[PDB]
């Protein structure tokens, strides 16, 4: 069905579309990270915003895992373990770079520990679990094409708003960190309407989260 | 808790002492495969034994990254993911690679669809399967650490048979393809505790994959 589907050229067209409605979302074209890019933050402010990042992207390698045992197709499995094997296949693994830039920028082990992030970051951390290892494969191959598109978007975002902090390209290295692997997964699950429904329905459940994570972070930080 | 582990001497006596138990376990130094390894088989028995593996191999490379969501320990997500890689990362991967064995020894798809494999066959895939996504993160260890200890001694084994009935080492390709695993490892089998479901993890593995050859044995005959 895969070798079907590559060859249609409605589905190339259909993804096409929902990488750009993806892109335009609230939830990755969002008012708070285009006004990060050029709005510089207090440290608490700042504190804020990374505090509640790191609750955000706690444990993500582990629950995309999660959607291997609901497949059994090795196109799908291949994509799960290229993403993972990015962030922890190799030393220093994106986390512990994560944690470095946090404890350059004032954020340290120990105030994370005692930090409350807000609900709808829990709810974000723990809707993303929920996407890719409690729903159909078409949702959550939704949800992850979601992800892979929006990410690149959100880091030069964040990059951007770093830069204009005023920290140096060393700095930002963990922001400054296959479209035809992951087109070529994906088109056996967006053929029929029902199909695209459920891969629609993790597109936008994925960045519904997003959205209204992105829309707490900004009352916390103001302007 | 990492760096105490691996700088327990004890641990690394102990971890060697199972590398040793696994190898000398009857279902990996089994008679089968020993008596395969110098007696070739007639078209029937050839076509059994390697339907039996085929039935064994399917869809384990899924079942190991069912691991994952027990722990959140990244050596241990990163020991999963390699294996895995290592078998989808790239094309060909190693189950299109034995899927055109079986076809260049008279296998093909068209057959294996319609193959009923043994019930031990069928018990050791999905007692895998179990091990690695249904049990605590030291007993999957322990089946995973077995797993990967005897999978390079196995398929030696077979590597051997099938040169001993006359096929090239292309033909064999499959079956040639063959500190990390302590690092990952060594936090988890530091209390007898830990060591107890750690064990029965490896034991449980093995259990499976003797009683699998015990029936692959019988199957195949003389
Ligand atoms: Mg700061
Ligand atoms: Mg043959
Ligand atoms: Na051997």
């Given at each position: 069905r895969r070798r079907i589907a590559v060859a249609d050229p409605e589905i190339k067209e259909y993804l096409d579309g929902m990488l750009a409605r993806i892109a335009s979302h609230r939830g990755v074209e969002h008012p708070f990270l285009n006004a990060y890019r050029t709005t510089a933050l207090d440290p608490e402010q700042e504190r804020h915003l990374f505090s509640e990042c790191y609750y955000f992207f706690r444990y993500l390698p582990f629950y995309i895992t999660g959607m291997a045992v609901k497949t059994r197709d090795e196109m799908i499995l291949r994509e799960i373990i290229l993403n993972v094997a990015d962030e922890v296949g190799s030393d220093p693994t994106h986390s512990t770079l994560f944690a470095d830039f946090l404890a350059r920028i004032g954020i340290d082990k120990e105030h994370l520990d005692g930090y409350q992030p807000l609900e709808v970051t829990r709810q974000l951390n723990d809707?993303?679990?929920?996407?890719?290892?409690?729903?159909?494969?078409?949702?959550?191959?939704?949800?992850?094409?979601?992800?892979?598109?929006?990410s690149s978007i959100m880091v030069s975002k964040i990059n951007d708003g770093?830069?204009?902090?005023?920290?140096?390209?060393?700095?930002?290295?963990?922001?400054?960190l296959h479209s035809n692997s992951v087109f070529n997964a994906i088109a056996p699950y967006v053929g029929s309407k029902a199909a695209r429904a459920e891969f629609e329905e993790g597109v936008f459940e994925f960045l519904g989260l997003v959205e209204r994570y992105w829309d707490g972070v900004r009352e916390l930080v103001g302007i």
């Open positions: 809707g993303i679990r929920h996407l890719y290892t409690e729903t159909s494969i078409n949702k959550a191959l939704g949800a992850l094409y979601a992800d892979e598109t929006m770093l830069r204009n902090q005023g920290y140096d390209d060393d700095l930002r290295h963990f922001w400054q």
